[PDB]
Amino acid sequence: EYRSTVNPWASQLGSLGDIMYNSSYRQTAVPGLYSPCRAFFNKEELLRN
Amino acid sequence: KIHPGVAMTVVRTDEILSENILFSSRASTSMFIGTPNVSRREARVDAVTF
Amino acid sequence: MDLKVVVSLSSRLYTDEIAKMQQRIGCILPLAQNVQGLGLGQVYSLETVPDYVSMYNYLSDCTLAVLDEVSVDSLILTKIVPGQTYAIKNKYQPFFQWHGTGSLSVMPPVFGREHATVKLESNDVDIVFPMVLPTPIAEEVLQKILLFNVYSRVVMQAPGNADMLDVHMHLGSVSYLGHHYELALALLDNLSLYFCIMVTLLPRASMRLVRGLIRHEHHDLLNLFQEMVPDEIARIDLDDLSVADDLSRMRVMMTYLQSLASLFNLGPRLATAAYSQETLTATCWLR
Amino acid sequence: MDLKVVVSLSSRLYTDEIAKMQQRIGCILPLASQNVQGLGLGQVYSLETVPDYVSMYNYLSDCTLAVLDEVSVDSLILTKIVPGQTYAIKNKYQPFFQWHGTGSLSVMPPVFGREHATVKLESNDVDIVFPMVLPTPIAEEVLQKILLFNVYSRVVMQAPGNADMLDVHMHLGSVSYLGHHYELALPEVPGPLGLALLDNLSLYFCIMVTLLPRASMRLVRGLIRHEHHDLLNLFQEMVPDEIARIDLDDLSVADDLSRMRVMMTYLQSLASLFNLGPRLATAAYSQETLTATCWLR
């Protein structure tokens, strides 16, 4: 509670760490392969919780 | 509105939804009615159709 | 024999799901049971582009099925044997025609993706029914969409060559058996590209094959009569190219001509016998 | 619907052949209609003629097929292929083809050598060679490769500077498969009916070359002028003389409809010429016992 984010290149809404792993920007991705950060950056399951 | 030198006769068809009275005499036809057959078509595990 | 297949839905459903199965009871869907892979719902997922050749080769890979009933959790449907005849309705978002056509086609809906895709928010299965349409209607709409996307990509390259009004006067209006229908608008892009490379490889391949088979029958009536017709502008430039690039051209040429010949053949080829207008149904067997 | 069709022999099938015939149970065999000759493929593929793979393909496509189920001594039974029935076929063929995707299976003559699908019958003066079963796309590329060799052996021989005859024998080479490459048998002379098939194909090719759609020429010229697509890699950023000289004219809407209409009917005719030989649509192939359940497509 004394800082905002440890890194700002993945925590904001349009960050590099977001656009690598969000569901809205993987619309040209290969659907088969697995990515572990999809359990963190994905908008639907972050909002499912 | 000058009348030209030729006369015309319009032809149009008018489709009419009518009602028809049907008659028959006494003992016109002879209905040979047989006993119906039953065949289980769908042998479903929820409800069976015959 | 019960040809019926049972599928259990995952969760509970609601009202307009019943309304949209009552809309789509008559129309049909392919097969792989497993509630995810029921039909074309693994190709129309938007994380990949909905392509035509992958969906078409899947549709020719799997069998077909008639949806029959949807209860609170069950999906009662029967599949297609080549043996006995089943009853088919239209129930399609284009409502085209059945005037006694003895040959049918089953193609994925090029007129609308969302026109045949039915969606449920509780169940993400996004199932979809490929458009059943008669064979002259099928060939006319596939021509009038393939040449349309060819013209669209050519205008995107150079707009000064092709226009839109004179092509919407003709290539947007299919007309078959007195009925004049209207249609206008990735998958057709790549399908056109396969045809684009096949029709540009067909000249060199054609002159190479007629130069190989030109003097087999040393005085033939038929061979000379097929040699007298084609283009004098075409048969010059063959011997300049190396061997391996030539045979790679012919190999890719043969693969995609076999692919596009089987693709221009209408895939799942149904056949109807007697169509009832007042019930909007016909009897069909697989052919 | 009868299936149990016995084929009566005339001599004693000895125990050196009973073992390898019981080894080949669940395979596919073509029928004549039995008599001891004409039941198989050795009646049309003998050692005296060239292996042409078209006349034997014609015998496979003209007459029906049959599953081998039991081989007794002095007689063996066969089970026909009537449509509407689900036939279970084991993969008992020496060039193995794994049916992962379970596509439409497809009959073929033994183009991968006579020696793997032959059986030596010394009871009667007859040899029986088994047809090859494999999925559809491998079968179609085998067809295109054997016709390409049958048309190109003669024209590589026809050059006076034949410094490379062996170029096509490795360029064509094996069949194109990921897990393993499988070399095949290559005949020098295509024979009569192979040349008749190439003659009909040349008929169709020169008829469809009279109508080319000019619209795709503009698109491929643009894709040359744009970035080099990986499907364009066969051109290596080159405009040949023919595509440069068929584009002096304009692009309209008049020719394109009749062009694509006759291309529809001629490509459907070419599919009918490439719907060649009886095929088997496959559903529910169980890999753990290697049985592909098929009905006659």
Side-chain angles (χ1 to χ4, degrees):
Chain A
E1 306 188 347
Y2 82 109
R3 75 160 78 95
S4 316
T5 174
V6 181
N7 83 301
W9 298 332
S11 43
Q12 286 142 344
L13 187 145
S15 315
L16 172 61
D18 203 347
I19 65 147
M20 275 189 288
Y21 310 115
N22 207 324
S23 174
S24 87
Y25 313 115
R26 286 192 160 207
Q27 306 300 316
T28 172
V30 169
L33 260 297
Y34 184 53
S35 68
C37 312
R38 207 194 170 248
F40 301 124
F41 291 102
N42 208 308
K43 183 58 139 52
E44 59 87 12
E45 53 94 21
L46 197 51
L47 272 46
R48 182 192 54 89
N49 205 20
Chain B
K1 280 168 298 304
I2 293 298
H3 173 55
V6 283
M8 299 80 66
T9 56
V10 182
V11 168
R12 40 190 183 85
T13 56
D14 300 335
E15 182 164 350
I16 286 171
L17 186 70
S18 69
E19 276 61 35
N20 306 142
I21 292 186
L22 183 55
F23 188 66
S24 161
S25 176
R26 181 185 55 87
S28 89
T29 53
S30 313
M31 296 323 177
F32 306 134
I33 305 172
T35 63
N37 314 332
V38 194
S39 317
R40 175 177 69 228
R41 187 61 180 276
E42 178 43 71
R44 206 167 70 212
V45 306
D46 310 330
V48 49
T49 70
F50 291 96
Chain C
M1 162 163 53
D2 292 348
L3 205 46
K4 182 259 292 178
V5 195
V6 196
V7 165
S8 176
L9 298 170
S10 89
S11 316
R12 203 146 276 185
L13 55 87
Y14 53 103
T15 41
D16 79 327
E17 185 156 342
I18 294 300
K20 73 178 54 75
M21 60 75 60
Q22 280 185 3
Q23 175 47 54
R24 299 315 284 251
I25 173 172
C27 75
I28 48 174
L29 80 160
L31 263 174
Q33 223 180 0
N34 39 3
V35 74
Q36 274 73 20
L38 311 166
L40 315 163
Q42 44 91 16
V43 194
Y44 274 98
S45 311
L46 267 302
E47 304 293 327
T48 181
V49 51
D51 204 295
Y52 200 90
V53 289
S54 87
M55 206 187 300
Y56 187 86
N57 294 160
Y58 161 68
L59 183 81
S60 316
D61 201 297
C62 58
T63 77
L64 277 297
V66 191
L67 158 60
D68 309 303
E69 204 266 350
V70 175
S71 54
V72 70
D73 280 327
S74 176
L75 171 66
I76 305 193
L77 61 88
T78 190
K79 36 185 192 294
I80 309 300
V81 62
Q84 69 255 15
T85 72
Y86 280 166
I88 181 64
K89 296 177 66 62
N90 171 260
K91 297 297 191 67
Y92 269 120
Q93 215 270 350
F95 294 83
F96 282 152
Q97 197 51 253
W98 320 99
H99 268 104
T101 82
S103 44
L104 266 296
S105 322
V106 172
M107 307 303 259
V110 302
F111 324 106
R113 307 305 157 275
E114 201 46 52
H115 293 353
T117 310
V118 281
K119 195 78 216 76
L120 322 167
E121 52 208 19
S122 68
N123 310 71
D124 46 352
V125 287
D126 75 348
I127 206 63
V128 49
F129 309 95
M131 174 74 198
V132 187
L133 79 173
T135 37
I137 302 280
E139 65 96 11
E140 270 196 351
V141 304
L142 73 90
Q143 291 184 53
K144 284 198 194 274
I145 197 156
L146 177 49
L147 307 172
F148 164 68
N149 211 355
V150 161
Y151 278 1
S152 158
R153 264 290 194 251
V154 164
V155 168
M156 204 274 294
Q157 183 66 241
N161 45 49
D163 63 309
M164 216 74 73
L165 177 50
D166 212 22
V167 314
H168 270 308
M169 194 193 66
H170 272 180
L171 263 57
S173 87
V174 284
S175 278
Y176 173 59
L177 282 184
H179 273 259
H180 170 220
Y181 301 121
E182 290 306 305
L183 74 163
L185 304 91
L187 69 163
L188 267 297
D189 279 316
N190 54 71
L191 296 181
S192 304
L193 304 170
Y194 305 74
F195 311 151
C196 177
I197 65 172
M198 278 319 110
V199 292
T200 189
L201 265 297
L202 183 148
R204 180 180 292 271
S206 57
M207 52 203 291
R208 178 63 259 169
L209 268 294
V210 298
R211 206 172 299 195
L213 272 298
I214 189 156
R215 315 301 311 117
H216 158 55
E217 284 279 343
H218 320 94
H219 205 49
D220 192 18
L221 320 178
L222 191 61
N223 291 148
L224 264 296
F225 264 79
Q226 54 87 26
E227 283 146 11
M228 63 92 79
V229 186
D231 281 310
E232 304 91 52
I233 201 172
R235 28 173 167 265
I236 48 168
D237 37 58
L238 182 51
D239 316 318
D240 52 355
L241 170 58
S242 63
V243 170
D245 187 88
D246 202 34
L247 265 74
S248 161
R249 280 160 88 117
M250 303 327 181
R251 173 172 294 114
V252 171
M253 195 278 308
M254 288 304 189
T255 60
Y256 274 178
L257 57 67
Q258 286 168 357
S259 158
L260 271 294
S262 158
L263 173 50
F264 286 163
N265 209 306
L266 276 304
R269 182 155 281 273
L270 214 50
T272 43
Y275 167 66
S276 87
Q277 278 273 13
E278 60 94 23
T279 314
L280 190 67
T281 176
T283 76
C284 68
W285 68 97
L286 191 64
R287 198 169 59 184
Chain D
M1 297 178 286
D2 189 5
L3 275 305
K4 271 79 72 176
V5 180
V6 78
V7 171
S8 76
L9 275 82
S10 315
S11 315
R12 185 49 192 250
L13 217 55
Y14 325 105
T15 192
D16 66 319
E17 314 160 31
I18 299 295
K20 50 193 61 182
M21 279 300 281
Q22 289 279 310
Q23 180 252 336
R24 310 278 299 184
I25 289 177
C27 278
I28 301 309
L29 291 184
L31 291 178
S33 189
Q34 316 199 31
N35 52 4
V36 310
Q37 43 91 11
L39 270 301
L41 207 61
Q43 65 106 35
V44 78
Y45 173 39
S46 315
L47 69 95
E48 57 87 13
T49 193
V50 69
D52 75 285
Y53 317 123
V54 178
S55 200
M56 65 192 75
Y57 200 82
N58 200 10
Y59 183 56
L60 275 183
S61 46
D62 272 335
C63 301
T64 187
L65 281 301
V67 192
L68 183 45
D69 55 357
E70 198 269 342
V71 176
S72 89
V73 309
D74 271 313
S75 281
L76 82 166
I77 324 172
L78 283 173
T79 291
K80 287 178 298 189
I81 311 299
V82 295
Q85 321 276 354
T86 317
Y87 305 100
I89 307 107
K90 206 180 302 167
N91 203 345
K92 281 204 143 201
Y93 303 99
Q94 324 200 342
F96 195 84
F97 290 121
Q98 184 47 59
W99 302 330
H100 274 147
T102 76
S104 177
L105 269 294
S106 47
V107 311
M108 271 303 146
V111 308
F112 301 96
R114 175 169 206 142
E115 74 276 2
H116 77 262
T118 178
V119 66
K120 310 297 290 173
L121 292 195
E122 305 319 293
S123 68
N124 319 93
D125 48 357
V126 59
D127 192 81
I128 296 311
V129 288
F130 275 53
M132 191 41 185
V133 190
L134 66 157
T136 304
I138 316 170
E140 291 308 286
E141 70 207 5
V142 163
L143 296 182
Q144 82 170 50
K145 278 175 159 292
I146 195 56
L147 65 89
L148 276 180
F149 190 70
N150 272 321
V151 71
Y152 281 160
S153 320
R154 54 161 296 166
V155 305
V156 165
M157 181 264 286
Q158 269 212 18
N162 194 11
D164 49 354
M165 177 71 168
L166 305 100
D167 49 348
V168 61
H169 297 72
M170 49 86 60
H171 183 87
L172 204 85
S174 160
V175 79
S176 316
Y177 192 76
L178 170 145
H180 198 64
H181 70 284
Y182 313 102
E183 297 89 1
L184 55 94
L186 287 83
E188 306 77 31
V189 194
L193 175 54
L195 284 172
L197 191 47
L198 313 172
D199 195 76
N200 297 134
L201 172 58
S202 67
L203 266 184
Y204 278 150
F205 270 162
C206 80
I207 288 313
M208 53 192 69
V209 81
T210 62
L211 280 84
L212 267 303
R214 308 261 80 92
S216 313
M217 301 307 116
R218 281 289 314 154
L219 200 46
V220 63
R221 274 179 76 107
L223 282 199
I224 283 182
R225 289 294 291 206
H226 210 56
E227 53 94 7
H228 203 60
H229 273 272
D230 51 355
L231 300 90
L232 210 65
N233 275 25
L234 86 172
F235 285 163
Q236 52 264 57
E237 192 59 26
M238 172 55 67
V239 175
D241 176 43
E242 200 49 60
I243 79 161
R245 81 176 38 219
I246 61 189
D247 295 335
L248 192 144
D249 204 28
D250 49 335
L251 183 49
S252 177
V253 80
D255 212 336
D256 197 17
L257 202 46
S258 75
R259 273 173 187 164
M260 203 49 60
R261 172 179 290 107
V262 305
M263 279 318 103
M264 280 315 116
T265 194
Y266 280 143
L267 265 296
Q268 282 164 6
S269 158
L270 262 292
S272 157
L273 215 47
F274 277 140
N275 176 18
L276 205 78
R279 311 303 196 196
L280 273 299
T282 308
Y285 157 71
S286 58
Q287 193 271 329
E288 65 287 343
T289 181
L290 195 64
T291 61
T293 56
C294 275
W295 71 97
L296 192 62
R297 199 199 67 176

